[PDB]
Amino acid sequence: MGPVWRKHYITYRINNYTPDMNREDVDYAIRKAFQVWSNVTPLKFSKINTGMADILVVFARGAHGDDHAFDGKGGILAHAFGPGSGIGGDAHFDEDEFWTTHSGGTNLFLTAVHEIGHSLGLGHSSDPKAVMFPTYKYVDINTFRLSADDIRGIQSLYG
Ligand SMILES: COc1ccc(S(=O)(=O)N(CC(=O)NO)CC(C)C)cc1
Ligand SMILES: [Ca+2]
Ligand SMILES: [Ca+2]
Numbered sequence: 001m002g003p004v005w006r007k008h009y010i011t012y013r014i015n016n017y018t019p020d021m022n023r024e025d026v027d028y029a030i031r032k033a034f035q036v037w038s039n040v041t042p043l044k045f046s047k048i049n050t051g052m053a054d055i056l057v058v059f060a061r062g063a064h065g066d067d068h069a070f071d072g073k074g075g076i077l078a079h080a081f082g083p084g085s086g087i088g089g090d091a092h093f094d095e096d097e098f099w100t101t102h103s104g105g106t107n108l109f110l111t112a113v114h115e116i117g118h119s120l121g122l123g124h125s126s127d128p129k130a131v132m133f134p135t136y137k138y139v140d141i142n143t144f145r146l147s148a149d150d151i152r153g154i155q156s157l158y159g
């Protein structure tokens with residue numbers, strides 16, 4: 001009749017690669033960040049460095065055409081949205097910061113999971129084990145999973 005994707009296919013693209021780390025690490029963090037949600041949600045993501053994508057990962061520094069935008073080390077870690085026009089879909093990371101794969105300062109992968117969840121279309125959870133929250137909490141990329149709470153939120157992407 002019939003169903004009915006929303007999306008099904010999430011083609012995504014990076015615009016530039018942060019010099020703080022080597023490119024492979026950069027796409028790796030984001031790749032894995034994507035892959036997280038792609039495991040729990042039926043959303044079938046695909047990074048294409050060449051072609052047309054649904055969403056775009058922005059890396060700017062300071063004022064990039066937002067009011068708040070940026071603030072160097074701290075403040076906003078990153079800003080992304082799903083269900084909105086224009087910018088909606090797209091995910092803006094704090095390039096001005098010094099992101100790390102290891103625990104270091106801020107973990108790229110960690111914030112990425114949060115913002116990429118926004119990209120799917122997630123209204124901020126209220127649980128500290130959940131990653132969707134507006135907050136930040138150091139999580140083991142060893143243990144690597146989502147919270148039961150968070151899992152309800154993400155299943156809410158239908159509906
Ligand atoms: C889970 O990873 C995160 C890292 C930093 C933040 S943040 O508190 O610095 N910040 C960015 C963010 O929440 N993006 O979705 C919100 C800002 C309002 C302080 C949030 C989440
Ligand atoms: Ca910042
Ligand atoms: Ca967009």
Ligand SMILES: [Ca+2]
Binds near residue numbers: 018020095096
């Ligand atoms: Ca940087």
Ligand SMILES: [Zn+2]
Binds near residue numbers: 064
């Ligand atoms: Zn922005």
Ligand SMILES: [Zn+2]
Binds near residue numbers: 114118124133134
């Ligand atoms: Zn957020």
